[PDB]
Design a protein around this nucleic acid. Structure first.
Ligand SMILES: [K+]
Ligand SMILES: [K+]
Ligand SMILES: [K+]
Ligand SMILES: [K+]
Ligand SMILES: [K+]
Ligand SMILES: [Mg+2]
Ligand SMILES: [Mg+2]
Ligand SMILES: [Mg+2]
Ligand SMILES: [Mg+2]
Ligand SMILES: [Mg+2]
Ligand SMILES: [Mg+2]
Ligand SMILES: [Mg+2]
Ligand SMILES: [Mg+2]
Ligand SMILES: [Mg+2]
Ligand SMILES: [Mg+2]
Ligand SMILES: [Mg+2]
Ligand SMILES: [Mg+2]
Ligand SMILES: [Mg+2]
Ligand SMILES: [Mg+2]
Ligand SMILES: [Mg+2]
Ligand SMILES: [Mg+2]
Lengths: 88, 35, 372, 124, 64, 117, 88, 134, 96
RNA sequence: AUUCUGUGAUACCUAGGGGACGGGUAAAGGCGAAGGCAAUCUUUUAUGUAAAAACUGACGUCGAAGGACGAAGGCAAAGGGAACAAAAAGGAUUAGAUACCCCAGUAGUCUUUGCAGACAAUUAUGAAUGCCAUAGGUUAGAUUUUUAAUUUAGUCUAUAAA
């Protein structure tokens, strides 16, 4: 501000304020969803030890396929009920 | 008439679904001490 | 030229199915939901029907017979086919009653579709021979270009900044040579109008440098040039310097093929009460009450704004089947986005009683037990 | 005017709670070992809960539930104390302080690249 | 930019022509002090364009 | 080529920011360049407090300058700016795809609109 | 964003747990009782109500299980038609 | 009169369950009022098309726009995945490189949104301040 | 003819760069006159000392989408004329 | 446990200095002869891909040798030194423990200039040419009634003939 300056630090972005329609218990839930969507906990676990480039590339390939397989599996499960509903 | 019969089904769902949020919302706080 | 087998398939019924038309256009930059989808503004697939003796067998003229559980039992046999045979070796179909019965419920209102008006209410049919025309001659001037409804060029105000650049690069840029010829044909009319007006007291029509100068003269008056450019690219009028150039021309026929009546100027002759003052009322359902401060009502399956005037102000869970209101459909029109918009108005009191009397819902019948 | 701060640093083996002034000067800097918890008893969820209740109690003695009108809760780390101490402030102990909370921040430290970490352990 | 002195000069002469202020369509009400000034504003505005464009199209200001 | 330099100078003295714009401007014109636009953004917050020349700055006086110049001229603007102790930070960029059609649509520096491309 | 992949040929297309294995509805009540003892004490009076709720758990009968979900039967019908095949 | 206030609470409660915005011209059937349709099974507010093509702008040429950078980063300063932006791989790379340029040049923060954008967003008087401490 | 089209396209780019040359600065005289006008202490409605004050924010995505989703209502008029002119210039070849 | 801390640590801050590293984006994605290549600005460099025309007119493929390039570790010299870490050493565990684990820690990793030439340097598959039926994805374009199809060059999945 004109008198006091804003504290611009990584925590400034991870801040959630209490207002009329949002109480302390409500700001905690919003803080947990954003901290989860941004995968802050996963980074703390991956930055604890060093993973050389080859191991990181191969770990991503295993996790990226399980994500496609799981996403393609949910589409087949729900496509099965679209056909069952039609009576096939 | 078909809309009436279908609107009622929604009313029952909304009435039964809103009770879930208000109950789970009020119970969010750990006020079980009953001070 | 074609084998007898190919000649039969051409005139076949399954070959006459219309292609799937694009869905009703929506906000291009706005977000939507891709998993779930509700009823569309207007239908995109053809609704199919069978004989009652064939429906019991599941035969719908398709590749395979349809399941009986999801196609039998109802009153109106209607089906929409998305793929006659999908990668699952099944006919991806769905019920077609959401639009098949919305058409019958709308036509039950017995109201035409009028041209959009501006705000002296003058409801003019959209099937008039002077306005409803699509074939035009190259001699077609500008004053009569406002009556049309089907233009070849796009509406510049409706395009996005991206679609407009693609248009300037692939449609108007390679038409410069053709436009210069279009001017020469005008010069043929400019040199003959002054050269043949005194004979009752054609020109070469091929020039190269004269055209370059004539265009410069028009730089002082930009309006006369836009009318000349739009007439060539067949652009829909934009501003008055008239045919509702606010939201743009309609992407379909002004009627959209939902109603073909040309006027509502008629009286309903009641069996006992003689002619009526207004058309019979229609009961509507209240959706999204004011408490956006605007209300929405469902009339014959279409959503419209509530009458300009409670039940439409605050939600009431005590009312069974939701809040309902008797109204009268004054005007119906088709906007530029293909939607059907109704200008509903509140219904009178005596009329709702007359309508309820026939169906047996009036409490105090106006006949017999009405001393005053 | 900046509020007070209720930093809650928690990791796998211990939890630190710091209550600072608006200028970020520590008033109550305690840990699980201040309550007598020895080498390994500091990582327990229960020990982190008692530390939170102890700090809240020590604040009342100092008359901070009346002096503090605006307070911020800063979370650092994802240890057991991250949830334990929150249930103290959100429970019956933080009844007086729960009304003066205006912000909820997360100050977990991450590195965009940074120095190399330890080599992976082979436990088996 | 794949230009040459010929194409460049032809474009300058073309831009000056289409942008040349057209005088009054007649001589009856032609306002002299308003036309002669537009000729100088166009001439001055033209000289500024030739100078700026000669510097942008200069091949010495290009890269590899 | 078409370049664009964003300069962030120390706030407080308007004479300083005017001397840098004129110095970097006269350098572009004398070398044979063309300045397309110079916008004067005022003094607002920096991305974060940064220390330069033994001073802790929280704000800075921004200004954008778009010019057509040669590589040697562009490298001298960056060198002179960086060497000046009154600039907190400078950002330079080569606009466009290097083609004539895209380069002809760069006029005034936008704030309430985008660069058409 | 891409669309869900077409699953490769699998030995069998099925979900591991067809019916949601819901949790004992009282393990949550006990946590509340254990929460009061940590804040209000053991022999206190505030926790006298939660204890009654906990005693009410075990005195009530256990809800009967739901009928099995037939999802796996329908997944096995549309496997070859929904995926690239079936492994032998 | 307090009995009238609780009615407003019950009313707005149901209004929240009607997860649909009715518009003029929208056709609806008796099925469009049932729970299965109001539930809104779609758990994603997907974007219609690639806005970079619809708006027709070059990201790299608009790196100096602080609002555009903050729109394609999370509150933590992390570039948004193509799932959220709904862009093609080519346009995703141009907007990702546009964010990295602005942050790399040092004109936009990297762990939150621009300070001048935080001054306007909700929580203005509550922004973290820096006490001089001396 | 194919090389003429490439030459005509290369010409229109110079005509557009010719029109835009009105606001360029080519001499020190225009530079000084430009700086002394825009670089003053009370240019941003001084109160305000930054472009964020006079002009609220740089146009965002929400502001770019509302221009084509929310409104569609009169701003389309000024937008319809600039587009109606671009079609004439690029079709006529001039700079109407 | 060795170890750090009353010479005030951990925790919470303010103000300066230093070295490397590269979060999200990110994908079955891309680039190069391979090795390999992921923050950012400017400068600089050879191929490759699409569509149309124009141009040269067999100017092509492979290629012993020579020469060039070639991961990590390593040698030599001069810098750098935060972090990590062979060696050396200490504390534990164990029947014993060089070890796996832990407190610390030097070469080395990084910079510049040379040497060196060995790799699961892998697709366990040399390079290139002609040719053989489909399907579902995906990458960069092109065409179109740009919805979606058609098509060129890549890449992957599952099959037919074989
Ligand atoms: K301590
Ligand atoms: K490799
Ligand atoms: K170490
Ligand atoms: K040892
Ligand atoms: K392919
Ligand atoms: Mg170690
Ligand atoms: Mg072991
Ligand atoms: Mg000290
Ligand atoms: Mg450094
Ligand atoms: Mg990365
Ligand atoms: Mg390649
Ligand atoms: Mg060769
Ligand atoms: Mg050899
Ligand atoms: Mg080496
Ligand atoms: Mg070395
Ligand atoms: Mg050495
Ligand atoms: Mg190296
Ligand atoms: Mg060598
Ligand atoms: Mg290797
Ligand atoms: Mg070989
Ligand atoms: Mg690849």
């Amino acid at each position: 501000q004109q008198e006091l300056n804003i504290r611009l630090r990584p925590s400034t972005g991870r801040t959630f304020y209490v207002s009329g329609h949002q109480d302390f218990a409500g700001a905690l839930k919003l803080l947990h969803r954003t901290v989860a969507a941004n995968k802050v906990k996963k980074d703390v676990r991956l930055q604890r030890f060093h993973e050389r480039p080859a191991l990181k590339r191969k770990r991503n390939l295993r996790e990226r396929w399980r994500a496609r397989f799981k996403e393609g599996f949910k589409a087949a499960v729900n496509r099965t009920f679209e056909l069952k509903n039609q009576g096939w | 008439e078909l809309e009436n019969k279908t609107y009622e089904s929604w009313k029952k769902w909304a009435t039964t679904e809103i009770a879930r949020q208000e109950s789970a919302r009020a119970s969010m706080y750990t006020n079980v001490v009953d001070n | 030229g074609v084998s007898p087998g190919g000649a039969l398939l051409r005139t076949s019924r399954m070959f006459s199915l219309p292609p799937v038309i694009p869905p009703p256009p929506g906000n291009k930059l706005q977000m939507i939901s891709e998993r779930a989808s509700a009823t569309e503004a207007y239908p995109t697939h053809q609704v199919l029907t069978t004989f009652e003796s064939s429906r019991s067998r599941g035969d719908w003229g398709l590749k395979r017979p349809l399941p009986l559980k999801s196609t039998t039992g109802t009153t109106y046999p209607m089906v929409k086919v998305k793929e006659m045979d999908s990668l699952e070796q099944i006919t991806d179909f769905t019920s077609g009653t959401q639009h098949g019965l919305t058409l019958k419920k709308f036509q039950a209102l017995n109201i035409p579709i009028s041209t959009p008006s501006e705000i002296r209410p003058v409801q003019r049919s959209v099937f008039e021979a002077d306005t409803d025309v699509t074939a035009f001659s190259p001699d077609e001037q500008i004053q009569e270009a406002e009556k049309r409804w089907k233009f070849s060029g796009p509406w510049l105000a409706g395009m996005t900044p991206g679609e407009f650049k693609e248009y300037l690069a692939k449609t108007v840029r390679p038409k410069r040579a053709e436009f210069r010829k279009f001017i020469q044909k005008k010069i043929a009319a400019q040199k003959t109008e002054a050269a043949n007006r005194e004979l009752q007291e054609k020109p070469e029509s091929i020039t190269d440098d004269e055209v370059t100068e004539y265009l410069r003269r028009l730089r002082n008056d930009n309006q006369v040039l836009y009318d000349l450019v739009g007439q060539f690219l067949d652009l829909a009028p934009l501003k008055p310097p008239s045919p509702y150039g606010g939201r743009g021309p309609p992407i379909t026929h002004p009627s959209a093929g939902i109603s073909y009546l040309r006027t509502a100027a008629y009286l309903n002759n009641h069996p006992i009460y003689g002619p009526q003052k207004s058309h019979p009322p229609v009961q509507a359902r209240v959706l999204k009450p004011r408490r956006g401060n605007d209300a929405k009502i469902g009339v014959a399956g279409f959503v419209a704004d509530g009458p300009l005037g409670s039940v439409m102000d605050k939600f009431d869970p005590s009312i069974e089947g939701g809040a309902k209101l008797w109204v009268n459909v004054d005007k119906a029109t088709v906007d530029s986005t293909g939607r059907v918009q109704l200008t509903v108005s509140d219904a009178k009191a005596t009329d709702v009683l007359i309508a309820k009397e026939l169906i047996g819902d009036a409490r105090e019948p106006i006949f017999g037990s009405a001393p005053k | 005017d900046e509020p007070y701060h209720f930093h809650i640093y928690s990791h796998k083996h211990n939890t630190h709670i710091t209550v600072t002034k608006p200028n970020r000067d520590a008033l109550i800097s305690l840990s699980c070992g201040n309550l007598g918890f020895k080498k390994s008893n500091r990582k327990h969820y229960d020990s982190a809960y008692q530390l939170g209740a102890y700090v809240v109690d020590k604040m009342h003695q100092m008359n901070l539930h009346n002096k503090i009108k605006k307070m911020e809760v800063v979370l650092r780390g994802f240890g057991p104390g991250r949830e334990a101490v929150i249930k103290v402030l959100l429970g019956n102990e933080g009844r007086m302080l729960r009304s003066s909370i205006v912000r909820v921040s997360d100050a977990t430290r991450l590195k965009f690249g940074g120095t190399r970490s330890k080599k992976p352990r082979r436990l088996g | 930019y794949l230009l040459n002195k010929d194409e460049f000069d032809s474009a300058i002469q073309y831009a000056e022509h289409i942008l040349k202020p057209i005088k009054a369509e007649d001589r009856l009400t032609a306002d002299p002090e308003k036309e002669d000034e537009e000729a100088r504003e166009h001439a001055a505005r033209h000289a500024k364009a030739v100078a700026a464009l000669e510097r942008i199209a200069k091949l010495e200001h290009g890269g590899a | 080529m078409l370049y664009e330099t964003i300069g962030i100078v120390r706030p407080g003295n308007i004479a300083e920011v005017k001397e840098l714009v004129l110095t970097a401007g006269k350098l572009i014109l004398n070398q044979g360049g063309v300045i397309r636009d110079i916008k004067n953004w005022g003094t607002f917050l920096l991305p974060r407090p940064i220390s330069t020349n033994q001073q802790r700055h929280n704000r800075g006086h921004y200004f954008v300058m778009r010019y057509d110049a040669s590589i040697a001229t562009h490298e001298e603007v960056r060198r002179t700016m960086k060497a000046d102790p009154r600039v907190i930070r400078t950002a330079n960029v080569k606009l466009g795809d290097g083609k004539l059609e895209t380069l002809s649509r760069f006029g005034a520096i936008p704030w309430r609109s985008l660069e058409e491309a | 964003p891409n669309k869900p992949i077409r699953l490769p040929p699998l030995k069998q297309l099925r979900v591991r747990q067809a019916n949601k294995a819901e949790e004992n509805p009282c393990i949550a009540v006990m946590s509340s009782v254990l929460a009061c003892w940590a804040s209000a004490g053991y022999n206190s009076a505030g926790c006298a109500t939660v204890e009654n709720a906990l005693r009410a758990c075990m005195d009530a009968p256990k809800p009967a299980p739901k009928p099995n979900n037939t999802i796996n039967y329908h997944l096995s019908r549309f496997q070859e038609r929904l995926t690239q095949g079936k492994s032998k | 009169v307090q009995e009238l206030l609780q009615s407003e609470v019950t009313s707005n409660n149901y209004m929240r369950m009607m997860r649909r915005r009715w518009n003029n011209g929208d056709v609806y059937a008796p099925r469009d009022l049932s729970p299965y349709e109001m539930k809104g099974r779609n758990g994603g507010w997907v974007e219609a098309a690639d806005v970079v093509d619809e708006l027709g702008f070059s990201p790299l040429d608009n790196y100096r726009n602080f609002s555009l950078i903050s729109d394609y980063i999370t509150p933590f300063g992390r570039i948004r995945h193509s799932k959220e932006t709904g862009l093609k791989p080519v346009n995703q790379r141009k907007i990702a490189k546009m964010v990295r340029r602005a942050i790399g040049l040092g004109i936009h923060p990297s762990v939150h949104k621009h300070p001048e954008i935080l001054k306007n967003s909700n929580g203005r008087h509550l922004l973290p301040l820096v006490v001089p401490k001396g | 003819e194919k090389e003429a089209m490439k030459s005509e396209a290369r010409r229109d780019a110079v005509v557009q760069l010719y029109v835009a040359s009105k606001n360029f600065i080519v001499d020190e005289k225009e530079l000084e006159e430009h700086v002394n006008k825009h670089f003053t202490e009370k240019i941003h409605n001084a109160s305000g000392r930054s472009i964020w004050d006079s002009q609220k924010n740089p146009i965002s995505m929400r502001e770019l989408r509302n221009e084509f989703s929310g409104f569609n209502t009169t701003s389309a008029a000024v937008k319809t004329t600039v587009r109606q002119k671009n079609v004439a210039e690029e079709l006529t070849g001039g700079k109407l």
